[PDB]
Amino acid sequence: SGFRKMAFPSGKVEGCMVQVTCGTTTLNGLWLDDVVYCPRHVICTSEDMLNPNFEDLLIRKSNHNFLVQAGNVQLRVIGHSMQNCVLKLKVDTANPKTPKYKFVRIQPGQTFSVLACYNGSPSGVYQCAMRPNFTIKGSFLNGSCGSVGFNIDYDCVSFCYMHHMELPTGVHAGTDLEGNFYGPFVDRQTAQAAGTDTTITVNVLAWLYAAVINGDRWFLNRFTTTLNDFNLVAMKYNYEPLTQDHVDILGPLSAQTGIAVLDMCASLKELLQNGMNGRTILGSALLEDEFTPFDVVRQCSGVTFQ
Amino acid sequence: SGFRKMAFPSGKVEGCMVQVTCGTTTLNGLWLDDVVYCPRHVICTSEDMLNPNFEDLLIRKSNHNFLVQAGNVQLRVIGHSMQNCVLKLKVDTANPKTPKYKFVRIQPGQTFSVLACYNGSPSGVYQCAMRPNFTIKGSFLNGSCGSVGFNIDYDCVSFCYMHHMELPTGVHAGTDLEGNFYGPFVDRQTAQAAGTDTTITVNVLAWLYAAVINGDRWFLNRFTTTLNDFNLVAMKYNYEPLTQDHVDILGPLSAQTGIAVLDMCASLKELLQNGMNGRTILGSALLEDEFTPFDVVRQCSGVTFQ
């Protein structure tokens, strides 16, 4: 029993982190096979970041201008190219610690673990969600760029995020491992609007199911609702609309607990309209939305990895 | 910027987890050098756990009755002994992935990371605190016994916790790596009282300092207090008393933010007396107490590990 925000074990990703230095800029890179992936802004000075022309800046850089260090050993760079907002440095040695992996572009509302790193070295691991407005609420300081987010399925690491920017609002933006930003953000130090940060309704419902499984039941009510009725409430509270796809994803949790999805929706509706009257659910005094239905099933059944 | 409950990278501990089977009971063990540590209840059936005589039960077990499996390879057990509530299985091979390590018995209110494992395989990592009543609020299912908690200092893993029991209240109890339980608990399936779970005041104050550092300032008030005045309030709300030792530990955070410790105490006092009026601090609608002052400094400055 118990329910905790839980990250994937980070060991397979630890063995992939390196330090990349170009000129006087140092950040983190991801070493898989004979390629090192890192944010293209590694080629920028603080001044360049105000209005960079990455193509023109990269024209000045040769292979030998990119220092790549893994632990205390130097990798030889034999090729470089820019793909969207990431650089790919071809090195002469395949990472012997490369796990089985793939690159995935995740959907808003999905979750993933972040291994925060500085100077190529791991600092910590935490769980977070791609917000509906395509930001993440992370914990990143200067030098953390190139940190990656990932999910693990048994022995295979799906990399989904590389950290690039902190918006002036303090939230974070970054790319997939092909270098395409999530959301409308650019790798330039300019004001950028994220947009309304809505709550991930299907995740809140999964977490309520998790609460029931663990004995937190007080919020169950005698009401039901309909999808359209519930969604009228959701709109008012800046919750994402719930679709039948979402209902389908919640099916197994509905089955396990015997609580129809729409009954749980009606319990969520009363929570949105009446608040939590100073009570808590799974140790939280607000509705948590950074657990997916799959996260709940995983944690509640003890799925392991290599 | 940003502030997240963050665990240590788990890779050094992943390489130490093995599966231990005795008869029909399987749980996790920790393989360091040529010794495997695991809960002594591995020798018990579900029936034995009602009223075990561990000495008498262990007398029946020989080295060859303990199956130890690391990945898909079997370790040869050449000796066994019981130390308090842990078994130590001497094996014929030193773990080649053994990190630098020590065993530490932590104080109530300290934090540590837990690598939850099943059948010797890692499932996830999360951060938690040794409560003042010597329980932890973890996420553990059947088979998770032998999971360990740890801290990391650069390249050295300090193991501080091994999981043994879930109390009927749903909270968790376990031992240090010498096998001595934290708190009054025993490894028997009987009712056991934890006692009043108080809030870790010094950790709440560190977290308030973390909030200020990140721009969450609304809770700062115009008041100050004294240690005795504050502690009268703390007693009323089941907060641990604050000592001058705690004030000293908060000194660097006081210095960084320019907020005297007792001024922050007065802000906490008003929060306890008036609640949070539906506001949040660092994304939480209650006062968080599972960050130590050292955790705040670490995260706010980006300390890394090998």
Author numbering:
A (entry chain A), B (entry chain A): 1 to 306
Study text:
In this work, we demonstrate that the SARS-CoV-2 Mpro is subject to redox regulation in vitro and contains multiple redox switches including a disulfide-dithiol switch between the catalytic residue C145 and C117, as well as a SONOS switch of residues C22, C44 and K61.
Interestingly, variant Y54F, in which the tyrosine that interacts with SONOS residue C44 is replaced, shows a similar catalytic deficiency (19%) as variant C44S suggesting that both residues are required for full catalytic competence of the active site. To define the structural basis of the markedly reduced enzymatic activity in variants C44S and Y54F, we crystallized both variants and compared the atomic structure with the known structure of the wild-type enzyme (X-ray statistics in Supplementary Table 1). This structural analysis reveals in both cases small structural changes mostly confined to the active site, notably of residue H41 that forms the catalytic dyad with C145. The structural changes for K61A are clearly more pronounced than observed for variants C44S (0.89/0.91 Å) and Y54F (0.24 Å), highlighting the structural importance of K61.
